[PDB]
Structure 1
Amino acid sequence: AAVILESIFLKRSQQKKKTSPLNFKKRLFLLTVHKLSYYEYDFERGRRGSKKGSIDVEKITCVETVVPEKNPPPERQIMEQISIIERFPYPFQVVYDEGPLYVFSPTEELRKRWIHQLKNVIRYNSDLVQKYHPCFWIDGQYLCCSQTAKNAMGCQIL
């Protein structure tokens, strides 16, 4: 199973559990036709660390950008070698059964490459969603429609 894409992004906690903070972590993302998984990146050795998350591609119903937070820390506010792994201001979402996984890219070009490839892979799903939430689901509700359920029907036609 070939690795379609491999990048270092910033991600928001999916807060699956109740006892989970709303924090961001740098992770190494790999995209195969079967799964989108992320690991801790071992910077020193220059390799991927322990798998920290995974999502079966057949469970993805939607992939799209997402309106930026209005007050982003410097870490997410809009030389290359360093900035491309320190600054992640272009967010996008990977929607599936367990709410949305938010991912922050370093450049707009990269987010485009990913969003384009994730669409080719999900093209094979039997029931993609026609709608989605354009804004972050932050603080118990969707800032784009105010619905509460993470997996609440998207408040906007694709």
Structure 2
Amino acid sequence: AAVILESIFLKRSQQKKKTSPLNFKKCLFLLTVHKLSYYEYDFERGRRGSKKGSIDVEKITCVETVVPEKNPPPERQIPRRGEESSEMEQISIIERFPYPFQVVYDEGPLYVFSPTEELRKRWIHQLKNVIRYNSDLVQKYHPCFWIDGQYLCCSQTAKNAMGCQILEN
């Protein structure tokens, strides 16, 4: 299969850590019609390093945006309403990741932060395409992050809880 998309995103850890040990780490994400996988990125050698995870596309049930953090650190803060920039800013495209989206499957939700709105859209559209004929697609989801033992949107404590919001219209 061909690699449909390849990007460096900031991935939130799943952990099982108290003391709000939420980790955000940059990973190289790859998408094919069969799997969404992620790896460490070997900057010096300019290639992907060891595999950190893999999700078979058929197990994905939902992919949508996530309501952003209320007061995120500067590296995840959403830029100016403007741009008109006919040029991708090299540094910010690998240092700032303000646009989160979620990939929902069996093992709870995976949260991914994109450096740009365009790129997040590109990934959500393509993921929606590759999961289109999946057996267990859900028509509800949690619009907000799961943090500190519960979803911010409905306060439920189970990660596999049915979504509290019906999709689109």
Question: Match of 1:69, SS?
Answer: coil
Equivalent pair of 2:27/2:39 in contact (CA under 8 Å): yes
**2:93 and 2:116 in contact (8 A); partners too:** yes
Q: What is the CA RMSD across the aligned residues, in angstroms?
A: 1.7
SS in 1 for 2:95: coil
- TM score, norm. by length of structure 1: 0.95
User: Do 2:9 and 2:112's aligned partners in 1 also have CA atoms closer than 8 Å?
Assistant: yes
Q: Which deviations, in whole Å up to 9, do the C-alpha atoms of 1:25-79 show, x marking residues without a partner?
A: 0000000111100000001110000001111111100000000000111121117
TM-score (norm 2): 0.89
More displaced, 72-81 or 141-150? 72-81
Unpaired runs of 5+ residues, structure 2, are 79-87
Shift of 1:126: 1.3
**Alignment identity in percent?**
99
User: What is the CA deviation profile of residues 10-35 of structure 1, one whole-angstrom value per residue up to 9, with x for unaligned ones?
Assistant: 01012268899420100000001111
1:86–1:129 distance in 2 versus 1, CA, 3 Å: same
Question: Aligned residue pairs: how many?
Answer: 158
Matched residue SS, 1:80: coil
- Deviates most, 12-21 or 98-107: 12-21
CA deviations on 1:128-149 (whole Å, 9 max, x unpaired) are 0010000000110000000010
Give the secondary structure class of the aligned counterpart of 2:155. coil
Query: Is the Cα contact below 8 Å between 2:153 and 2:164 reproduced in 1?
Result: yes
d(CA) in 1 for partners of 2:152, 2:3: 34
Equivalents in 2 of 1:51, 1:20: separation in Å?
25
> Deviation digits for residues 69-108 of structure 1, max 9, x if unmatched?
0011112111700000000000000000111000000000
* Contact 2:6/2:29 (<8 A) preserved: yes
Deviations 1:106-136 (A, max 9, x none): 0000000000000000002012001000000
CA distance in 2, matches of 1:121, 1:18: 35
User: Is the partner of 2:129 in helix, strand or coil?
Assistant: helix
Of 89, 94, 106, 1:97 maps to 106
Specify the alignment match of 1:141 in structure 2.
150
> Are residues 1:33 and 2:33 paired?
yes
